[PDB]
Amino acid sequence: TIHKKGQAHWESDIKRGKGTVSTESGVLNQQPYGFNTRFEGEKGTNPEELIGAAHAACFSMALSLMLGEAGFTPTSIDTTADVSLDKVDAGFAITKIALKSEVAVPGIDASTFDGIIQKAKAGCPVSQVLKAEITLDYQLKS
Amino acid sequence: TIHKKGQAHWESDIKRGKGTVSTESGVLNQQPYGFNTRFEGEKGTNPEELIGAAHAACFSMALSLMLGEAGFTPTSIDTTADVSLDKVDAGFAITKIALKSEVAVPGIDASTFDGIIQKAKAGCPVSQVLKAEITLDYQLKS
């Protein structure tokens, strides 16, 4: 199995405390995060946008793979993942991720493409591991 | 409802194609990713380490909060999230996330702490949204 690691550091309480997040690749190295950026809308990284990025990335790559297996080559795939963090009795929960994608695949049938993209939406590794509602809105250029 | 966004871009097929990943905060901005970095172990970002970073960050924040609710203030929390991407019949799947955390909470009861940290491991938002097995290994300095 493939193992990849992420890390975080936290110090003090939630209001007066702060933290940082990193990844083994180094793309993220002690990047600041906290209550402000996660719940108060202050610009900065947080768990949600990171999961959104991971999801957009896994979905896009999966769409390319499946398209290839169908004998198609995508010119470009641009996916956005909107992660919803809602308030619930237990606190908060990631309830939905809205995927928005613009794909360009030369001469591919609209009906055939839809079948492939819906399979990617529900079949990629990240979608499969998430419990949140996953929606998909796309635009095909062929 | 809080909304956070992530995105990704991909061009060409899976072997000769390539992609990038970004987040709205900018911590990730068109950072390269591909088959190489995700499946061949080449150093670079990928969906798995991003989920790991997100999980480590959520879990550490959640632990601080709960300790606070118990009347405790953590001196420091350092968590690493090890994400497993396994090959399965249908393709691949994120089967497990192993959390390892080092926490310093002066004077807290060992048993008291264990109950709290276990509740955080199972109850934080990111743990809650994941279907993968989540394990916890920690070392408390008290």
Side-chain angles (χ1 to χ4, degrees), chain A residues 1-14 17-72 74-142, chain B residues 1-14 17-72 74-142:
Chain A
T1 136
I2 295 171
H3 286 85
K4 297 305 167 73
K5 302 172 178 184
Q7 64 181 58
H9 168 85
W10 187 274
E11 64 187 12
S12 190
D13 64 58
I14 181 61
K18 47 179 286 299
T20 68
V21 58
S22 306
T23 60
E24 69 178 345
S25 74
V27 297
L28 285 185
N29 190 328
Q30 305 177 71
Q31 195 64 210
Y33 84 102
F35 189 79
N36 60 302
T37 61
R38 193 177 195 186
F39 300 108
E40 301 300 75
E42 186 176 311
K43 183 160 175 188
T45 196
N46 49 71
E48 291 58 54
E49 68 159 30
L50 291 176
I51 288 182
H55 200 178
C58 181
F59 166 76
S60 302
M61 176 183 277
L63 178 59
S64 177
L65 185 61
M66 297 187 89
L67 281 170
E69 301 176 307
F72 295 108
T75 302
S76 67
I77 295 174
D78 291 298
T79 304
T80 297
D82 190 326
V83 189
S84 290
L85 179 60
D86 284 303
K87 171 63 179 59
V88 298
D89 304 324
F92 293 76
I94 295 162
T95 56
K96 187 173 77 171
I97 296 188
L99 301 175
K100 176 178 177 55
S101 192
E102 299 175 50
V103 184
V105 185
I108 184 174
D109 178 63
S111 180
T112 299
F113 181 75
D114 185 69
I116 296 177
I117 196 165
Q118 295 309 324
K119 283 279 292 178
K121 189 210 67 176
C124 73
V126 176
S127 295
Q128 285 279 303
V129 74
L130 297 173
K131 298 175 179 173
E133 179 188 342
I134 295 169
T135 63
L136 169 66
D137 286 296
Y138 70 97
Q139 298 172 300
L140 175 68
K141 292 185 178 183
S142 49
Chain B
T1 161
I2 299 176
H3 286 82
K4 304 298 192 175
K5 305 178 181 180
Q7 61 176 52
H9 169 80
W10 187 277
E11 61 198 18
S12 184
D13 53 66
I14 184 68
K18 50 188 280 296
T20 65
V21 57
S22 315
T23 58
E24 76 186 329
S25 69
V27 302
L28 284 179
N29 175 40
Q30 299 186 57
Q31 187 66 203
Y33 85 100
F35 190 74
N36 61 310
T37 58
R38 190 178 196 183
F39 297 105
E40 306 301 70
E42 185 181 305
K43 187 170 184 173
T45 200
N46 52 73
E48 293 60 50
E49 67 159 28
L50 296 176
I51 288 167
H55 201 179
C58 176
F59 169 79
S60 302
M61 175 188 285
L63 173 63
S64 176
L65 194 56
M66 297 187 101
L67 285 174
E69 302 187 304
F72 296 113
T75 297
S76 68
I77 293 171
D78 287 293
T79 305
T80 290
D82 183 330
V83 183
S84 295
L85 178 60
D86 276 303
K87 177 73 188 72
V88 295
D89 304 318
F92 291 84
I94 295 173
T95 57
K96 181 173 69 172
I97 297 193
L99 300 167
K100 172 174 175 52
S101 184
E102 289 175 40
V103 192
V105 183
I108 188 165
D109 179 67
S111 182
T112 295
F113 180 78
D114 185 84
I116 297 178
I117 195 167
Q118 292 300 325
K119 292 281 289 188
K121 188 222 61 178
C124 70
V126 180
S127 282
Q128 283 282 311
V129 77
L130 300 167
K131 294 171 188 164
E133 164 176 24
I134 299 166
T135 65
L136 173 66
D137 289 296
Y138 71 93
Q139 306 177 330
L140 167 71
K141 284 178 176 177
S142 60

